Structure 1
Amino acid sequence: LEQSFDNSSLISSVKELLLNKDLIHPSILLLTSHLAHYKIVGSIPRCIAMLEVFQIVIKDYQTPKGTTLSRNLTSYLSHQIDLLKKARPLSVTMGNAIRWLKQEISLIDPSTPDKAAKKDLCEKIGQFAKEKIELADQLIIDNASTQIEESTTIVTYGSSKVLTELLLHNAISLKKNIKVIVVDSRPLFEGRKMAETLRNAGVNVMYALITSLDTIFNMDVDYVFLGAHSILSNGFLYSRAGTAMLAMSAKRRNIPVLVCCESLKFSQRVQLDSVTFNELADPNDLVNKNILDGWQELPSLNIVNILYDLTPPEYIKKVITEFGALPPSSVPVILREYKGSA
Structure 2
Amino acid sequence: LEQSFDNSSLISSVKELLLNKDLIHPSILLLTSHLAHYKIVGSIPRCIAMLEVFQIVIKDYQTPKGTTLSRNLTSYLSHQIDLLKKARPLSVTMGNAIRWLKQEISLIDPSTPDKAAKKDLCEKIGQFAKEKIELADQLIIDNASTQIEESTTIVTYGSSKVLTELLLHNAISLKKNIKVIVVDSRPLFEGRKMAETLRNAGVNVMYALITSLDTIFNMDVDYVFLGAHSILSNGFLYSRAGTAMLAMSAKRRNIPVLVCCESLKFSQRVQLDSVTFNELADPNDLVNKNILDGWQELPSLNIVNILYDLTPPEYIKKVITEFGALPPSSVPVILREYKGSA
For Structure 1 versus Structure 2, the TM-score category normalised by the shorter chain is: over 0.9
Structure 1 window deviating more from structure 2 (3-12 vs 237-246): it is 3-12
How far the C-alpha of 1:100 sits from its partner, in A, is: 0.6
SS at 2:169's partner residue? helix
Alignment partners' CA distance in 2, 1:9 and 1:17: 19
How far the C-alpha of 1:247 sits from its partner, in A, is: 0.2
| Corresponding residue for residue 72 of structure 2 | 72
| Corresponding residue for residue 23 of structure 1 | 23
Alignment partners' CA distance in 2, 1:41 and 1:286: 19
Q: How does 1:285-324 map to 2 (within 5 A)?
A: 285-324=285-324
| Corresponding residue for residue 210 of structure 1 | 210
SS at 1:32's partner residue? helix
Ranges of 4+ aligned residues in structure 1 off by more than 4 Å: none
Alignment partners' CA distance in 2, 1:129 and 1:27: 19
Give CA deviations for 1:86-134 in whole Å, capped at 9, x if unaligned: 1001111000010111011111111000011101111111001111111
TM-score, normalised via structure 1 length: 0.99
Give CA deviations for 1:162-185 in whole Å, capped at 9, x if unaligned: 000000000000000000100000
SS at 1:167's partner residue? helix
Q: Give ranges in structure 2 of 5+ residues lacking alignment.
A: none
Alignment partners' CA distance in 2, 1:176 and 1:212: 28
Alignment partners' CA distance in 1, 2:122 and 2:168: 30
How far the C-alpha of 1:242 sits from its partner, in A, is: 0.2
How far the C-alpha of 1:12 sits from its partner, in A, is: 2.5
Alignment partners' CA distance in 1, 2:249 and 2:8: 29
Give CA deviations for 1:43-64 in whole Å, capped at 9, x if unaligned: 0001100011111101111111
How far the C-alpha of 1:295 sits from its partner, in A, is: 1.0
Give CA deviations for 1:289-341 in whole Å, capped at 9, x if unaligned: 20101111110111111000010000000110011100110011011111111
| Corresponding residue for residue 187 of structure 1 | 187
Alignment partners' CA distance in 1, 2:267 and 2:194: 27
Give CA deviations for 1:147-168 in whole Å, capped at 9, x if unaligned: 0000000000000000000000
How far the C-alpha of 1:140 sits from its partner, in A, is: 0.7
How far the C-alpha of 1:250 sits from its partner, in A, is: 0.7
How far the C-alpha of 1:8 sits from its partner, in A, is: 1.5
How far the C-alpha of 1:238 sits from its partner, in A, is: 0.8
Identity %: 100
SS at 1:258's partner residue? strand
Alignment partners' CA distance in 2, 1:291 and 1:144: 45
TM-score, normalised via structure 2 length: 0.99
Alignment partners' CA distance in 2, 1:105 and 1:144: 35
| Corresponding residue for residue 117 of structure 1 | 117
Give CA deviations for 1:248-294 in whole Å, capped at 9, x if unaligned: 00100001100111101100000001100001111000000201011
How far the C-alpha of 1:79 sits from its partner, in A, is: 0.3
* Alignment size in residue pairs: 342
**Is 1:158 matched up with 2:158?**
yes
Q: Give ranges in structure 1 of 5+ residues lacking alignment.
A: none
Alignment partners' CA distance in 2, 1:89 and 1:13: 11
How far the C-alpha of 1:21 sits from its partner, in A, is: 1.4
**Is 1:100 matched up with 2:100?**
yes
How far the C-alpha of 1:66 sits from its partner, in A, is: 1.3
How far the C-alpha of 1:7 sits from its partner, in A, is: 1.6
SS at 2:17's partner residue? coil
How far the C-alpha of 1:13 sits from its partner, in A, is: 1.4
**Is 1:274 matched up with 2:274?**
yes
How far the C-alpha of 1:16 sits from its partner, in A, is: 1.4
How far the C-alpha of 1:29 sits from its partner, in A, is: 0.4
